[PDB]
Symmetry: none
């Protein structure tokens, strides 16, 4: 099996689901007492936060790129970034370390395609919803049309993540706001909705939509196990 290099700690709470699910998938596929071979570089989140606060994505890219190279030295054969948003620097990481990088958007696209879907709604941080790294990749690489909320609604979705969910605040009114945004996406004729942030799943679930939901973190973890065993 391939040794997976995970870059996490952003936050450590959202890294645990990867570690759990990759291991569960490997055990299911191989049986015995098998678990995944994982080398996880868990950074101090504060360092990344200070960089984001200064808009210094260059240095943030360097920090995670260096983690990837360290994982390569340790024997990792592929890189898995355990956060949707930090894929903002995935191209930098991949170019820097020379290992394959299992991109979260590509893993989601696989499942979307498997369901025959060509038009999807997308929820996440503003970065994830607006920028080329995730939304642009679904479309330009995989030919999937992506619909996001309007600006006022993206502001609310984003604020709730950083302001509440990230701090462990799970609000009923925030849930109702997401429920409304979901209905608006569905009104645009989307065939499914991507929950493109681990924390979103703390607030809403499959019962809050009338179309298939895609939990990108869970899908990414499953994809990572599949890759290790391929």
């Amino acid at each position: 099996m391939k040794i997976l290099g995970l870059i996490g700690g952003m936050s450590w709470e959202s890294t645990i689901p990867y570690y759990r699910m990759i291991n569960q998938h490997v055990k299911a596929q191989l049986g015995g007492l098998h678990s995944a071979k994982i080398i996880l570089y868990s950074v101090d989140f504060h360092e990344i936060e200070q960089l984001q606060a200064k808009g210094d994505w260059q240095t943030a890219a360097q920090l995670l790129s260096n983690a990837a190279i360290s994982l390569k030295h340790a024997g990792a054969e592929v890189i898995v970034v355990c956060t949707n948003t930090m894929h903002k620097v995935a191209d930098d990481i991949e170019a820097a370390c020379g290992l394959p990088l299992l991109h979260i958007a590509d893993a989601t696209a696989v499942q979307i395609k498997q369901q025959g879907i060509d038009k999807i709604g997308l929820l996440g941080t503003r970065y994830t919803m607006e920028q080329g790294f995730y939304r642009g990749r679904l479309t330009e690489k995989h030919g999937i049309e992506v619909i996001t909320p309007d600006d006022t609604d993206r502001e609310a979705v984003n604020r709730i993540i950083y302001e509440e969910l990230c701090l462990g605040i799970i609000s009923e009114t925030s849930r109702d706001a997401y429920r409304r945004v979901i209905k608006k996406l569905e009104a645009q004729g989307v065939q499914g909705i991507i929950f493109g942030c681990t924390e979103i799943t703390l607030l809403v679930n499959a019962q809050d939509a009338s179309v298939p939901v895609f939990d990108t973190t869970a899908i990414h973890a499953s994809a990572a196990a599949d890759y290790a065993l391929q």
Copy 2:
């Protein structure tokens, strides 16, 4: 802070509490969005169990040692083995990688000695209660007298962990048995009791003892965080 190198996957389920507790300690001490700097090498448990089943400690030590060396290449400055029985080859791993290794028995011995305790009761799997790597180390290295239950009670304790607690089964007769064994250790004049694995606390806790109880796993994770921050 120092970068911690964790060797886990033995099993992965028991690695999660280490990762969680170490991060929680760092957040509590440093505040803000601080998390621990951790590089975790999670091995395939099937390989380790197979070697252990053959009594091939030499190869097992080599495998863990290679993991420790990998972590060193990635930047780890200290090694924490997130399991109890593999500590049988802790001194070999430490010598092989040239990094300090925070031994699970040593971390607990420090707490016991600081509290003035010189006679301790030990509960855990049969291996932990009988073998040299944990109990022998407390005595030979730290000068602490170790009392264990009698043969009948060790068998009962061990059976309950393997056949019940490990299966998620909580029996009220088994809880009573553990309570009785604790009282028996206390009647022998122990000044504290070590819980050698986390499974024990599914049945009993400090409320069941008149002497202090030492959760060796919890102490290990706390010692790791402390070392990283010193």
Copy 3:
């Protein structure tokens, strides 16, 4: 005594306590060398889980119905399904085999009513807390008022069972969460609290509650023994 037909293997770990407790109850009541007369059909959980994940309740019903008919052929006189959520198709299983089925929700309702309680708290998976087969059955069939946690707390309770407890992962923050949810239920005026699955006991127990706890699994086993002896 009646021959009990147990349908288990969902999972096999969960079946062991039913088998043990029923036998213990019979021995306690009849004394001497008596044990229960049990015929157990233990299914392949993989088949059930796959059907459950696809929402194919019809086929799941057929599978368990065939198990029940098999037990009838072997001489069983009553059916006990050793799991909570498959009770979703209990009425279909009962009809298929023509034997009485001792429903997990009825057994607990009976204990609640005998203790003069008409307002109860309910903790369990989201299935159990939200669907008709258990929650709705307590209220509709037995006239018992059922209070469950709010949306947020239900998500947490459920996530913790699936993501942690089922894996043996005991998290103190999770323990704290359950303790708060219990106090919130009590604040609501519930006269007792049901633990819908044994996983909950891994984290919390009677000490954590100011009201009587109803372990629906233990109660189910007790009811099965009592019925056999009736």
Copy 4:
């Protein structure tokens, strides 16, 4: 997967280890969430005992045979009798139901022969050590010579199983007796030793023998799981 028909041991405590081990083996070999398909018939020992006391051994035998015929009706494809001593009626059961019976002695014999062994020492209840059903099968059917302890040692071995080991009592003097009996078998030139029941492993194990030891009950459960998967 074949459906296994298990006939419970006189004590349900003796049956649970078969259910646990078979399931663990199937999960290990197949992965997923797979568990064994087992139909277990667990009798009320009182009923058997009462018939025997009355001197009606034929009806008592018919009762176990009846259990096997019932398992056939339920769809079992092979009979597995739990415990070595129970095999005293294995021949009767097999003749009565017409299903293949996976005999504890045959499962162990093929493992012994694979190791190139043709002379073994046998420890167990006096029944197991003296009667035809187990040892006779090893010698007559498989060509394995069987050495047993002398009469005084058989009495001791037997008493210790019934009076101590079945109750989980571990006596140092009993352990010493078993160790001596092992050396006496080794002195007779045995190439391996069979532990007739798993209770024996409470006193002695591989560390006490200078020849390979065979836990025939554990081997039996392993063989049952293996056969279900063929």
